[PDB]
Amino acid sequence: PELPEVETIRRTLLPLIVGKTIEDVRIFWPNIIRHPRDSEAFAARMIGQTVRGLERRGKFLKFLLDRDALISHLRMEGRYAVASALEPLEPHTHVVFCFTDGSELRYRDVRKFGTMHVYAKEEADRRPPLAELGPEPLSPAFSPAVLAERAVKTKRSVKALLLDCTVVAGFGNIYVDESLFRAGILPGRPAASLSSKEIERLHEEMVATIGEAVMHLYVYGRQGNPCKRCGTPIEKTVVAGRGTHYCPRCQR
DNA sequence: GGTAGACCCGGA
DNA sequence: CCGGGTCTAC
Ligand SMILES: [Zn+2]
């Protein structure tokens, strides 16, 4: 899921788990667990804790328990569900948190690509994977001035800059391409070549792009089809080792 | 500071 | 053999 879908998951999942107490944690693919390094320690430590909250940072979910925070990334195919311990698990279920009321929070992932880390709540923000994560794109902490500062100092393309998780949290390939299109900026432009006007416009479109979705695509996956604004065929290239989609007329 | 390997596997 | 995102390794 992209950032807006992760926000919907956070909002939806919270009431289904808040106040519930963990009675067991079952792990069917231990490699998902990244901290503690031993999946047996991960499971042991969570037993007896109650779910108190659920927050999001970038595309990470942060489950707040009594003492610990569980930081979860679903990547593109991970999914959570709350369901009865009496019913058979869905295929590709890798981790299950069993609650004392006979319900479960289940993590499933055909790609087995997701990650979980657990630390004391107070340590979570300064440890991987949240350490160094940039500001929320919808926060005042993400500003044209913050963007301008990072752009001036780099040799990289503007696409590469926006894909850097330390610049802004949870902007992936799709919203990077879409934001650049809406701002009229070619993805392969060096970040340091953008004018002040271009940085301001890009910031505005990034916020609009994420903001509207959290509440139709112009270029992403649309190569060969006409631009929705000028009718020019959308093109696809490689920029910063990613599939990159753009209108060669609208973007400069 | 900036690139690359490592995770993962359904479908081309 | 490719795709994604985000960490660890050069
Ligand atoms: Zn166009």
* Secondary element (H or E) of residue A72: strand A68-73
**What are A194's two structure tokens?**
């953008």
* Secondary element (H or E) of residue A5: helix A3-17
Of A57, A59, A159, A222, catalytic: A59
Is A247 annotated as ligand-binding?
yes
CATH architecture assigned to A1-132? Alpha-Beta Barrel (3.20)
Listed as ranges, the nucleotides of chain B within 7 A of a protein C-beta are 1-4, 7-10
Q: Which class would CATH give A133-252?
A: mainly alpha
Exposure class string for A143-166: b at 16+ Cβ within 10 A, else e: eeebbbebbeeeebbbbbbbbbee
CA–CA gap between residue A206 and residue A162 (Å, rounded):
10
Is A216 annotated as ligand-binding?
no
Domain ranges of chain A: 1-132, 133-252
Give, as residue ranges, everything with CB less than 5 Å from ion ligand 1.
Answer: A 227, 229-230, 232, 247, 249-250
Pair type for strands A53-57 and A33-35 = unpaired
CA–CA gap between residue A91 and residue A36 (Å, rounded):
26
Interhelix angle A196-214/A144-152, rounded to 10 degrees, is: 130
CA–CA gap between residue A205 and residue A203 (Å, rounded):
6
Q: Which residues pair with A196 in a beta bridge?
A: none
The protein residue nearest B7 (Cα–C1') is: A113
Listed as ranges, the nucleotides of chain C within 7 A of a protein C-beta are 3-8
Q: How far is the CA of A110 from the C1' of B11 (A)?
A: 13
Q: Is A1 a catalytic residue?
A: yes
Count the helices and strands in chain A (H runs, E runs): 6, 11
Q: Which residues pair with A26 in a beta bridge?
A: A96
A157 by DSSP, 3-state: which?
Answer: strand
Whose C1' is closest to the CA of A238: which nucleotide?
C3
Whose C1' is closest to the CA of A161: which nucleotide?
B2
Count of positions (residues) in chain A: 252
Using alpha carbons, list the distances in angstroms from residue A245 to A126, A179, A206, A225: 35, 11, 16, 11
Is A98 annotated as ligand-binding?
no
The residue to which tokens 């942060």 are assigned: A62
Sign, CA dihedral A10-A16-A18-A23, equals negative
